[PDB]
């Protein structure tokens, strides 16, 4: 209907936004693991939204109320559920990495962002970064990028949850009384 | 049997049990990965009754 | 008519219950194997003792 179409449009917009953000993450510097850039989750959301747009075109075109329609409506529902799960997982990963990165002091080196976490005793974890233009430039905008990306996947996951919830409420909330 | 509210309580109970079991399986996998587990012992640290190795 | 689990849904429910039971048994066997191999007991690991400090 109209509401599923709006939800699919929001899904595609947010998927393209998060994929663009992940591509920018990768392009800034290859200092970050594949987990920390959730662009894979963005691509998954993008294919989800592509299937959604095809669904909401074919439903408005022809073959509206047959059995196979429901047979892959269930596929749409489960696919949106996995999209929501992957979005929440990306949120969790980004939150953990931001929490690690937000409570440490860093210094610049000749070619890398070598620095350590605050330590009670002189041995602790050390992090170095590829091709750092300045340790006060990448670190200082990375947190802003992370926060924006967090908001992006939070909204995407909420939209996915609502999309999953709407069709189920359509099916299992109203029971017919008269005949 | 299982007509009404009994069904809607049994389903919730089964779902809760499944979630707990999944969490427990994750904890077990985490243990098996932190300790490099082998049938003889942790990684190369062989363990027997007499002592370590 | 009749209400509750009547046809194929009963078979699906029984299959899901059996599968969950199998998974729980497998997890229990894995944990018991860990306990046997590392000799975990009421007194500790029986070979080390991770103190709080």
């Amino acid at each position: 209907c109209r509401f599923p179409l709006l939800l699919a449009l929001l899904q595609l917009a947010l998927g393209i936004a998060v994929t663009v953000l992940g591509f920018l993450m990768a392009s800034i510097s290859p200092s970050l693991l594949v987990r920390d850039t959730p662009f894979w989750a963005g691509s998954i959301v993008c294919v989800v939204a592509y299937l959604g747009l095809f669904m909401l075109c074919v439903s408005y075109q022809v073959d509206e109320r047959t059995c196979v329609q429901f047979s892959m409506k269930v596929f749409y529902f489960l696919l949106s559920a996995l999209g929501l799960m992957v979005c929440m997982l990306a949120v969790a990963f980004a939150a953990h990495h931001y929490s690690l990165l937000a409570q440490f002091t860093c210094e610049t080196s000749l070619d890398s962002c070598q620095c350590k976490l605050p330590s009670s005793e002189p041995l602790s974890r050390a992090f170095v970064y590829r091709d750092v233009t300045d340790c006060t430039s990448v670190t200082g905008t990375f947190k802003l990028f992370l926060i924006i990306q967090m908001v992006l996947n939070l909204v995407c996951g909420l939209v996915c949850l609502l999309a999953c919830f709407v069709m189920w409420k359509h099916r299992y909330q109203v029971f017919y009384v008269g005949v | 049997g299982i007509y009404g509210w009994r069904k809607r309580c049994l389903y919730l109970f089964v779902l809760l049990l499944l979630a707990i079991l999944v969490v427990n399986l994750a904890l077990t996998i985490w243990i098996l990965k932190v300790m490099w587990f082998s049938p003889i012992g942790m990684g190369h640290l062989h363990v027997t009754a007499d002592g370590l190795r | 008519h009749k209400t509750g689990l009547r046809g194929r849904k009963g078979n699906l429910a029984i299959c899901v219950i059996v599968l969950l039971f199998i998974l729980a048994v497998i997890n229990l066997l894995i944990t018991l194997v860990i306990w046997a191999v590392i000799r975990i007991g009421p007194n500790g690991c029986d070979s080390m003792e991770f103190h709080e400090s």
Binding site: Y172, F175 | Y3, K7, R8, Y11, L12, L15 | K2, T3, G4, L5, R6, K9
Partner: peptide
């Protein structure tokens, strides 16, 4: 008797 949680 449509079954669900």
């Amino acid at each position: 008797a449509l079954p669900k949680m």
